[PDB]
């Protein structure tokens, strides 16, 4: 009955996984709530994550998260994939996210030639774009609402219009549903998210998305 506790070392990998979903046309966001939450934990670090859970009364069986190279056959030819050792997310699911993302990337090349940095799966702000949706869901959880989904989509289409222009897979309805699902199924993620947001919103300036997140997070307490 383990909880994966990713450390700072797999932060870049989790951001890239977020970015792979963000470039996927009609992406399956079933795992985005979990992946976003894994990104938040990698930003907090393993030590602070275990501290948060233990202090909150949750008894945690910590699973170490490392990057492994998994060799698997796709269309007759053997391919190498970098995956995370996660008890909550199978090797198969991770590899299929990379496969679907690579199909959307080839379609992009065919449409516009080589892709600008801000349109790629490895843009440094992908994890934070996902956590912006989490910040909107947390507000609706706070306000007492349950059928707050309609307002999440509507607020998201306004606040994240530049990012939605950059990413075909930024689908607020599906992503909000995935976070609602993870916060109700795993309430310990609410404590992790709140500690992440308090710590993030301390870091002054930086990136446009980091600023959008800090603003969205600050709102959950009256703004
Ligand atoms: O020249 C590049 O940087 C490059 C090449 C490719 C590709 O061939 O899919 N891609 C996309 C890509 C690479 C790696 C992974 Cl893990 C996922 C995706 Cl979508 N980027």
Curated annotation (Swiss-Prot):
Taxonomy, superkingdom: Viruses
Cellular component terms per the entry's GO annotation: helical viral capsid; host cell cytoplasm; ribonucleoprotein complex; viral capsid; viral nucleocapsid
Localization: Virion; Host cytoplasm
Keywords: Capsid protein, Helical capsid protein, Host cytoplasm, Host-virus interaction, Inhibition of host innate immune response by virus, Inhibition of host interferon signaling pathway by virus, Inhibition of host MAVS by virus, Inhibition of host MDA5 by virus, Inhibition of host NF-kappa-B by virus, Inhibition of host PKR by virus, Inhibition of host RLR pathway by virus, Interferon antiviral system evasion, Phosphoprotein, Ribonucleoprotein, RNA-binding, Viral immunoevasion, Viral nucleoprotein, Virion
Processing after translation: Tyrosine phosphorylation modulates viral transcription and replication.
GO biological process, one term: symbiont-mediated suppression of host cytoplasmic pattern recognition receptor signaling pathway via inhibition of MAVS activity
Region (Interaction with the phosphoprotein) residue spans: 1-222
Family to which the UniProt record says this protein belongs: Belongs to the paramyxoviruses nucleocapsid family.
Subunit details: Homomultimerizes to form the nucleocapsid. Binds to viral genomic RNA. Interacts (via N-terminus) with the phosphoprotein P (via C-terminus); the phosphorylated phosphoprotein P binds to N-RNA complex. When in a monomeric RNA-free form, interacts with the phosphoprotein (via N-terminus). Interacts with protein M2-1; this interaction allows the association of nucleocapsid with the matrix protein. Interacts with host EIF2AK2/PKR; this interaction inhibits EIF2AK2 phosphorylation of EIF2S1 and blocks EIF2AK2-mediated translation shutoff.
Reported function: Encapsidates the viral RNA genome by forming a left-handed helical nucleocapsid that protects the RNA from nucleases. RNA replication depends on the availability of soluble nucleoprotein. The encapsidated genomic RNA is termed the NC and serves as template for transcription and replication. Together with the phosphoprotein, sequesters host NF-kappa-B in inclusion bodies (IBs) thereby inhibiting this host defense pathway. May also act as a modulator of the innate immune response by sequestration of host IFIH1/MDA5 and MAVS into IBs.
Name of the protein: Nucleoprotein
Naturally occurring in which organism (per UniProt): Human respiratory syncytial virus A (strain A2)
Protein's gene: N
Covered residues, full protein: 31 to 252 of 391
């Amino acid at each position: 009955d383990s909880i994966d506790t990713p450390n700072y070392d797999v932060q870049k990998h989790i951001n890239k996984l977020c970015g792979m979903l963000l470039i996927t046309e009609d992406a399956n966001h079933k795992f985005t709530g979990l992946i976003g939450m894994l990104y938040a934990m990698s930003r907090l670090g393993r030590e602070d994550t275990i501290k948060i859970l233990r202090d909150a009364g949750y008894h945690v069986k910590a699973n170490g998260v490392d990057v492994t190279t998994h060799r698997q056959d796709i269309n007759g030819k053997e391919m190498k994939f970098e995956v995370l050792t996660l008890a909550s997310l199978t090797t198969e699911i991770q590899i299929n996210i990379e496969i679907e993302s690579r199909k959307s990337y080839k379609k992009m090349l065919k449409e516009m030639g080589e892709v600008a940095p801000e349109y790629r799966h490895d843009s440094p702000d992908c994890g934070m774009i996902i956590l912006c949706i989490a910040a909107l869901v947390i507000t609706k959880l706070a306000a007492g609402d349950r059928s707050g989904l309609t307002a999440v989509i509507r607020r998201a289409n306004n606040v994240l219009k530049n990012e939605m222009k950059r990413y075909k897979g930024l689908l607020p309805k599906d992503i909000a549903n995935s976070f609602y699902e993870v916060f109700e199924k795993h309430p310990h993620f609410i404590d992790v998210f709140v500690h992440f947001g308090i710590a993030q919103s301390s870091t002054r300036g930086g990136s446009r998305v980091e600023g959008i997140f800090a603003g969205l997070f600050m709102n959950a307490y009256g703004l």
